[PDB]
Amino acid sequence: MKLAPYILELLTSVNRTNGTADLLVPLLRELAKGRPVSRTTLAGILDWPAERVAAVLEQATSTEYDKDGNIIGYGLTLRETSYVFEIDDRRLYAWCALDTLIFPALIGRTARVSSHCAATGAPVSLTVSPSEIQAVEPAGMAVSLVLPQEAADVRQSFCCHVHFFASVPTAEDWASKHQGLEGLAIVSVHEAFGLGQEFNRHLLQTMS
Ligand SMILES: [Hg+2]
């Protein structure tokens, strides 16, 4: 239940260059409107030249673009994933279970989150607000964690192993067949949410 290593490594992998955190929050808030985000829109919000925005994103290897070259994915995405993340009347998606717990606080909006247990396929859902989770169904929902790798693409090294599960026992049974996953751990969705809070606290402190 010692979570500092996860926080530290996730911060290091997310914070590739200066301005990343300054860029990320407004980007998330724009994406949350459910439409592709142009680099010029970001430039305007931030008061940066579009050239600088381009510089930041260049380092964010996993960033998803549409056929128009607009941003459609950076943690929160318009491209379908296993993690549905709805704000108001807009269906968005997230790259992993932990993202769904972290983003509402950064966006400042409540999200309806839904997915399926990675071990059993059972539907899972909850409401995530910037301060708390509610309507956790099933109530014993769990999350898998692994240790992020600093220089690797965050999706292939972290996101793809961070799932929701129907319960802790179910997830632990699943985990027994997943050795070599560095720092693989099962926590309750509540502990994962608390992890997200500490992550956010450290991330926001690095903003201008
Ligand atoms: Hg993720």
UniProtKB/Swiss-Prot annotation:
One of its GO terms (molecular function) is alkylmercury lyase activity. Pfam families: HTH_15 (PF12324), MerB (PF03243). Its EC number is 4.99.1.2. It is an enzyme of class 4 (lyase). Keywords: Lyase, Mercuric resistance, Mercury, Plasmid. GO terms for biological process: response to mercury ion. It catalyses: an alkylmercury + H(+) = an alkane + Hg(2+). InterPro entries: MerB, MerB_HTH_dom, MerB_lyase_sf, WH_DNA-bd_sf. Belongs to the MerB family. Cleaves the carbon-mercury bond of organomercurials such as phenylmercuric acetate. One product is Hg(2+), which is subsequently detoxified by the mercuric reductase. This is Alkylmercury lyase. It comes from Escherichia coli. The lineage of its organism: Bacteria, Pseudomonadati, Pseudomonadota, Gammaproteobacteria, Enterobacterales.
